[PDB]
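Q: What would this complex look like in 3D?
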Amino acid sequence: DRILTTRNGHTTSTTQSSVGVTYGYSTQEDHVSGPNTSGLETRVVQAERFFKKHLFDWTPDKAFGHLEKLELPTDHKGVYGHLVDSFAYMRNGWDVEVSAVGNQFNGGCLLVAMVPEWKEFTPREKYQLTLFPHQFISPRTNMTAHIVVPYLGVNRYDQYKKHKPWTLVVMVVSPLTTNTVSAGQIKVYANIAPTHVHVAGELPSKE
Amino acid sequence: TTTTGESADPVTTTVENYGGETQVQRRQHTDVTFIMDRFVKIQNLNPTHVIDLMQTHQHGLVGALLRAATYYFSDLEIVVRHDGNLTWVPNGAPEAALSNTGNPTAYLKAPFTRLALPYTAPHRVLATVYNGTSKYAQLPASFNFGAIQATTIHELLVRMKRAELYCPRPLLAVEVSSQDRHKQKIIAPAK
Amino acid sequence: TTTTGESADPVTTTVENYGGETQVQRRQHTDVTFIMDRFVKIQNLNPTHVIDLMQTHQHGLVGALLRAATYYFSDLEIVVRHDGNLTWVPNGAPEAALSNTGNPTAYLKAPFTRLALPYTAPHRVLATVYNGTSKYAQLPASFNFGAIQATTIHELLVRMKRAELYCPRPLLAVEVSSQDRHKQKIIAPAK
Amino acid sequence: GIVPVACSDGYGGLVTTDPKTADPVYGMVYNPPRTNYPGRFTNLLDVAEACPTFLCFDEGKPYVVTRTDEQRLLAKFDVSLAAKHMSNTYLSGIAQYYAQYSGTINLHFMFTGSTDSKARYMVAYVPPGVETPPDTPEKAAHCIHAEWDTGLNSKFTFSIPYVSAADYAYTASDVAETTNVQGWVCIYQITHGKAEQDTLVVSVSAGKDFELRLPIDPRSQ
Amino acid sequence: GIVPVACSDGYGGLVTTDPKTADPVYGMVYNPPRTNYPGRFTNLLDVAEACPTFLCFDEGKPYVVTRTDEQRLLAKFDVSLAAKHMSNTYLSGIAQYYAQYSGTINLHFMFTGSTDSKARYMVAYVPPGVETPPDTPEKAAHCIHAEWDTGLNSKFTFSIPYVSAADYAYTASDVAETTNVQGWVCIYQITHGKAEQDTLVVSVSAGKDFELRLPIDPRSQ
Amino acid sequence: SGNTGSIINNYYMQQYQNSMDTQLNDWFSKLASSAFSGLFGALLA
Amino acid sequence: SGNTGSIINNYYMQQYQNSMDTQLNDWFSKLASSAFSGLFGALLA
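A: Here is my prediction, written as structure tokens for the whole assembly.
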């Protein structure tokens, strides 16, 4: 079964070239009600839905090791984004779909990974990014990678304006190859949904 | 074994595929708690010193394995060679407290002092990397095991007890230029 | 919670009033016997010294908590660094007795002498403040744990054992002038 | 032969907080009885919960007062055991000897006006995350808050909740932290009727789950 | 009297890996809960088995490629955890801290060509005993080997067997050993069809019976 | 009792280690336990 | 637990020797155990 439909709230995504879903580090969330929020946290399901971001253009000239990253959360102009401005503390996991649409006559390979506590990796460390939750996108096989990760961090709730626990990373493993019948470049997009969104500590209004 | 590589599902083929036989393995030496449980040097010292495991050497056995994890937890043992009495204060204490006897203070007894200390951070686990700031690169100041002070601190060894590691990160061997193998003098009998 | 404040009846409202949830608390560290049970310095010494807990420093952990009680009881441990032999006599002894060997006398053994002593006052409890005179400000002379004498007394540490405190009294933090918070250097990792 | 032992390097030194006992030297002492001596306390937090002590506002007054009947911020203070306003309280006197705490802190408000003076007040807990505390009841309404008026019962008590990233917070405050790490408490007067010279006395006590841990000896000695 | 003991010469010194514990000094500390924190690993080899990491070929590429459709040796490397090609792998990163190993090492081959590119490959394990590795698939056919072609499944995995005189082998390599003590792995392209710019990505993981023993601290510090 | 954590007994008898109490009670614990909580009046939650 | 091999108990209580954990899981062991082995397809052995 290569055809998968994912639903997050009133948004869905259907892909006919998937290689399944990779769960990173766990298949469930730690407890969302601990001592640090004194039972004042609440869940906001209206934020649990897909938002979109263009990551980069995969062109033939990008060599092995070329890396593009997106720290999460990112700027969000919807419900999730308003939560970041209205509550002091939050926690959520991520449901991540990355697509790279060219055609089956393209060759090459991208590594898609979710990295906790991002730090710039040296060139030698790039050979080991598969230690992190990941999938590959290779035109001969799939156009979509799908990874699901839980919230984590030294603190049970976080202040996202000060710390970003997860970073989506896309790295060229083998360069994009082109033919007379292939696409000439592939635009890479992310379709991301925050999961199990909890907030605590309502803030005053700015005016 | 043949599979879909893109899915990234673990695949562990064996010699049975071509008629061999998989043997018994004993992995006690690569057990995490066991391997981290030995003393290593801290090295950059001052008479007032905040205990931070990230000050272990990055290529040392313990320092490298610690950096190959994102989060960790452990209790601690320290061996300190010092002049004067040694005082320790927990994570969060005002530096000024290091001057008082009411905090655990060890009176000098040659050749050095060995103590067992509990984890005292306010976080459920600590991290070796932290992507963000802690103030209103570096690690938040709260990532420590307390601080010690003596007239002079000559040497400090730390030992992680009942260690737990989470979320593996890259761990590198020396880079090789030989084009075939990194070669070095392995111990061998004289004459 | 709404109440009659004048009656002064204890009232302890909780976060449940507005939908929160009260958590579990572990208060071992504020247990009285536990907190007083550690060595602290006495400081103003002489070769002949009457053991009086009121000579602990008023802002020290033990000295401040002791002064935050009106009456107390405890047994004692002392650590004494001295030249010569150390003699101890109980509460009520003539000072002259300090010169004789028949009273508990500890022969010098480096680096110092540690002893367990019983409470020996003639009163059921002692007090940190006493509103009146004892002769036929200061505390009655009978409020002590005996006396010690050596050729020289270099250092004296005391430790309250199985302490009991009664009738709380004011306990003050440092006064603040900052107008917002008392700020100080909290220990944090180097570099 | 006899038992062989290894006297071990690194052990045996005196540690001021060690968990062992000294050797005794003077036995059989029986004490005068002290059965049922009154006023005993066995845990500092029992006292801290039961006996609220006064906050300190401008000019060393344990109360706030206002002469205008308009809505106004009567006081704002850091949720910190090292706050200026908490500096004469028993809770802060105890907290200075521990490195960390978590749990509820209870504020008590007692109105002392005459029978013909009435007022309506509001208290809000403002978490960290904003530059400055809200100056009006309207902006603060979006925070966790309580409003109450004066009447037969002169006292109102409100729990300041523990809401933070980590499970424990430091009792002391560092020189580097500019705005308070745990947020603020803001007390407003919504309005009043003939309450110009009348005051609101404020005190603080430990809540049911308030906890202090890791004993320290920090004062200059 | 009291117990007589012999304080024994030669015992009691601190040894950095001793199996005893220090005396405690600060009791009753309860930790924030960390129940079910995700991503825990309790043995380094669980990680090494589950997460293959990339080999390093000429010019720092995790793959081999060939432009001719003729049969050719695409790569040859020493079966050594100290091999140049293994130098950026997690398996070698762990192995440097142990003096010896035994057991299976698994190689993974992932073809990344377009749908219209096809190839047939061969991997052979050449034990010690010959001067130089075979340069053609025909000579290498007499060794333990596997051949496979590209298709719907892009990945092929092959176990490098542990075959040696002794029960364990050294993880490091000595300055005196000229040809590798454990043999070689040779990867050949039998032929291909329109696969000139297409690559074969190679990674390595620990096999089921791979084992490391005798912890050492060898890096320059 | 207090800050002591030896799993093993004391080598000395109690009549020597400490003074012995004779007979002829936690007030603040009772006081704190007796505190009012909740509200007062009528709730409309 | 770890690198310790005394046949005899510890002289000190656990509440002193170590910190105590509270409650409110080996991911990589599960991940490795779950790996596919064998082949895929049809064997002609």
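A: To summarize the key features: The first strand of chain A starts at residue 4 and ends at 8. The radius of gyration of chain A is 18 Å.
Q: Very helpful, thank you.
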